[PDB]
Amino acid sequence: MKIGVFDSGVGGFSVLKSLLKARLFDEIIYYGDSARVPYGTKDPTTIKQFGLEALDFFKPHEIELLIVACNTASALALEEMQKYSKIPIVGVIEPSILAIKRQVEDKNAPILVLGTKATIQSNAYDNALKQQGYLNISHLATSLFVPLIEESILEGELLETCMHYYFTPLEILPEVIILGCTHFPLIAQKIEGYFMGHFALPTPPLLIHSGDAIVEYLQQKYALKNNACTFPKVEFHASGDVIWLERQAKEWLKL
Amino acid sequence: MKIGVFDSGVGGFSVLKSLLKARLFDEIIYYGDSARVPYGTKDPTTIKQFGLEALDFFKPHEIELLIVACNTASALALEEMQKYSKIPIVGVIEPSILAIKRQVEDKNAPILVLGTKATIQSNAYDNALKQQGYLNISHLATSLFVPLIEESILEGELLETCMHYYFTPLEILPEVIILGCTHFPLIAQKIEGYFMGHFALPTPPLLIHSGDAIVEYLQQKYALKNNACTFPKVEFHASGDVIWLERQAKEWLKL
Ligand SMILES: N[C@H](CCC(=O)O)C(=O)O
Ligand SMILES: N[C@H](CCC(=O)O)C(=O)O
């Protein structure tokens, strides 16, 4: 079918990479609000309005389903967007909760949630996780990860120092880490390397990928074949220069 | 005289600080496009439109002069803005050149220009400096400085490492450093310390402050006295939550 994917910028490509891999949809209309990104360092009122405005962008595209690839938008504007919609709107938060429920049996397992300041402040993951019984949960806003990753600073001294800055105050060694942000998958191995090295772990904690989770959810609900289509057509749209956004699509979608 | 001050967000408070200290105007209308900050990591077309939209916001306020405190907006949209406006519009680039002309007699003195990617990409400083005869200029886009500063990372290993990441590749030790971004004054002492420490200098390179430079230019161009109210009328406006914008002011107006 034909669907739309919404994100604040190019981070949502991490989710698009997953969606493509699953070969679930024939046509995908991706819209990145690159003129206003990032959303994570802003307020609830502003983000909700951005969410509603994303709706207006897709209305004429005739999409059968809208994926809010942005973790920040999913945590603050999903509710409203759905209230006003003739079609289904799926965020990347709830699907990750389901991924945890089946991947993390022990309700006492230490879980660390990483996200933007807005996503963490919303308690979106904390609320959802507790409902499912989990009692050992920790939350951490790692905002500088976003700009570092957009500068393509995916390794080296600076990145290590930034992770050390954010992770040092942590009280509990996580057994599971949720990548509650579109950009974090790009430094997944680095995050794993940090904990394995700093805490001398034989194996890294478990990381939950937002894109892979929403895929598992969309394959279940809205039942879809794992190759219901050959070459999916994709449209790229942005509030900023679309050429700049498309250029990054190459880098993010690349294996 | 009633004036307007435009910036992409809270960074412009560094210019507001200079304006307030000089006591030139009795009324100042501050507008920060906080819903869309930052401008520096975006494209020319997007930035130019933001500039024109800033003019639409100010038209109703009937200001007599508009200060574009944003170095990025100054570099990319100043020309377009001045074209469709009947009131004088002053950016923070030219005043800096005029201040350098006066402080640096040696046209061969090594000058280092720091700014956002968009500001540096525009070559606005390069072209303005050469016109005045300067021949030893280096340009560096220190993008990460912006988010670091907004998270108030003004000390510690992360700031040192970020500074080292950008500065270490420099082939020449600057004698003059242009803080070509609203945010940099907040780490001015740290930058001075970096060069004094790393190059065993008894005194730091001369830093050019955008805010003081435009205030000085304004003071002379309009022959203004420093006798305006000690506590003038200041209005704060923002595209994002204005409460968030205001609460940040003390971080910049501080002492
Ligand atoms: N896409 C956002 C990260 C970038 C932003 O702050 O807008 C998220 O998933 O949280
Ligand atoms: N105000 C911008 C810094 C923040 C931004 O990029 O928007 C400048 O002076 O270049």
Q: At what resolution in Å was this solved?
A: 1.9
CA-CA distance, A94 to A135, in Å (whole number)?
Answer: 18
Cβ–Cβ under 8 Å, residues B118 and B47: yes
Q: Is B154 helix (H, G, I), strand (E, B) or coil?
A: coil
How does DSSP classify residue B157?
A: H
Amino acid at A157: E
Q: Is B43 helix (H, G, I), strand (E, B) or coil?
A: coil
CA-CA distance, B214 to B70, in Å (whole number)?
Answer: 11
Domains recognised in chain B with CATH numbers: 1-91+210-255 (3.40.50.1860), 92-209 (3.40.50.1860)
Q: Please give the helix or strand (H or E) that residue B137 lies within, else none.
A: strand B137-141
Cα–Cα nearest to A136, from A100, A106, A98: A106
Sequence-distant (6+) residues with CB within 8 A of B59 are none
C-alpha R_g of chain B: 17
CB-CB neighbors (< 8 A) of B248 in chain A: none
Pairing of strands B89-91, B65-68: parallel
Tokens encoding B70? 């944003």
The 3-state secondary structure of chain A reads CEEEEEECCCCCHHHHHHHHHHCCCCEEEEEECCCCCCCCCCCHHHHHHHHHHHHHHHHHHCCCCEEECCHHHHHHCHHHHHHCCCCCEEECCHHHHHHHHHHCCCCCCCEEEEECHHHHHCCHHHHHHHHCCCCCEEEEECCCHHHHHHCCCCCCHHHHHHHHHHHCCCCCCCCEEEEECCCHHHHHHHHHHHHHHHCCCCCCCEEEEHHHHHHHHHHHCCCCCCCCCCCCEEEEEECCCHHHHHHHHHHHHCC
Task: Give the HSE-up count for residue A228: Cα atoms under 13 Å, Cβ half-sphere.
Answer: 14
What are the beta bridge partners of residue A28?
A: A3, A234
Q: Is B150 close to A41, i.e. CB distance below 8 A?
A: yes
Cα–Cα nearest to A15, from A73, A88, A68, A77: A68
Q: Please give the backbone phi and psi of residue A84, each rounded to the nearest 5 degrees, phi first.
A: -110, 80
Q: What's the gap in Å between A118 CA and the centre of ligand 1?
A: 9
A123 is in an annotated binding site: no
CA-CA distance, A196 to A194, in Å (whole number)?
Answer: 6
A168: left (phi over 0), alpha (psi -120 to 50) or beta: alpha
Question: In this complex, is the C-beta atom of A46 within 8 Å of any C-beta atom belonging to chain B?
Answer: yes
Q: Is A147 close to B150, i.e. CB distance below 8 A?
A: no
Cβ–Cβ under 8 Å, residues B144 and A141: no
Cβ–Cβ under 8 Å, residues B12 and B6: yes
Tokens encoding B232? 């003038």
